[PDB]
């Protein structure tokens, strides 16, 4: 159990270092405040990565027959360390869209 816990701690540290280039001490690492802050920061980042992709203007001649990697996949690469599944991501997005006054996007996600 000691080795499994220590392995989990170093796995989290290495995943956070490689996917984010964030380097601190273990006292700053184990503090849940930074974990929650980085979780909400990349929740907001995922909000924008799709919000810009709802067309507010005419599309650009980019990703034409050669489509760019999805932002959701990069967010999931980041969140594999954060242990956030798709259900929790959709739950958080529903509340965040509800706070923005967007009703349809929350109802559609609830229905799905």
């Amino acid at each position: 159990d000691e080795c499994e816990e220590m392995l989990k701690l170093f796995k989290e540290v290495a995943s956070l270092q490689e996917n984010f280039e964030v380097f601190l001490s273990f006292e700053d690492y184990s503090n849940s405040s930074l974990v929650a802050d980085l979780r909400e920061q990349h929740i907001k980042a995922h909000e924008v990565a799709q919000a810009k992709h709802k067309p507010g203007s005419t599309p650009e001649p980019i990703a034409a027959e050669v489509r760019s990697p999805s932002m959701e996949s990069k967010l999931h690469r980041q969140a594999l360390a954060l242990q956030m599944s798709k259900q929790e991501l959709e739950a958080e997005l529903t509340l965040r869209a509800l706070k923005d006054g967007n009703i349809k996007t929350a109802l559609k996600k609830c229905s799905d």
Partner: protein, 97 residues
């Protein structure tokens, strides 16, 4: 027996069709190829969930489990064949697969 398997082949003739959007599981780097692949996989599990709910407490335990295993075998052996017939799998593909 023959009446029951007539329902099985009708159900299989749905699952493979729901996998028609899998696009041979190629070019996972594209966002559309990832979305259209998730669309097939969600619906394949959803069909079996509802079918199992329908057949719940109707068939005996042995035959229900055997029929479910038989349907899931066809569901999984198609994805396995699609993956083993691929040619290019990059680092991004190895994560989304």
């Amino acid at each position: 027996t023959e009446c029951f398997l007539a329902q099985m082949r009708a159900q299989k003739g749905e699952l493979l069709e729901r996998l028609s959007s899998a696009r041979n599981f190629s070019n996972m780097d594209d966002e559309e190829n990832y979305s259209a692949a998730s669309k097939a996989v969600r619906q394949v599990l959803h069909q079996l969930k509802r079918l199992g709910i329908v057949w719940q407490d109707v068939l005996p335990v042995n035959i229900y489990c055997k029929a479910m295993g038989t349907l899931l075998n066809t569901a999984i052996s198609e994805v396995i064949g699609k993956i083993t017939a691929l040619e290019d799998i990059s680092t991004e593909d190895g994560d989304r697969l």
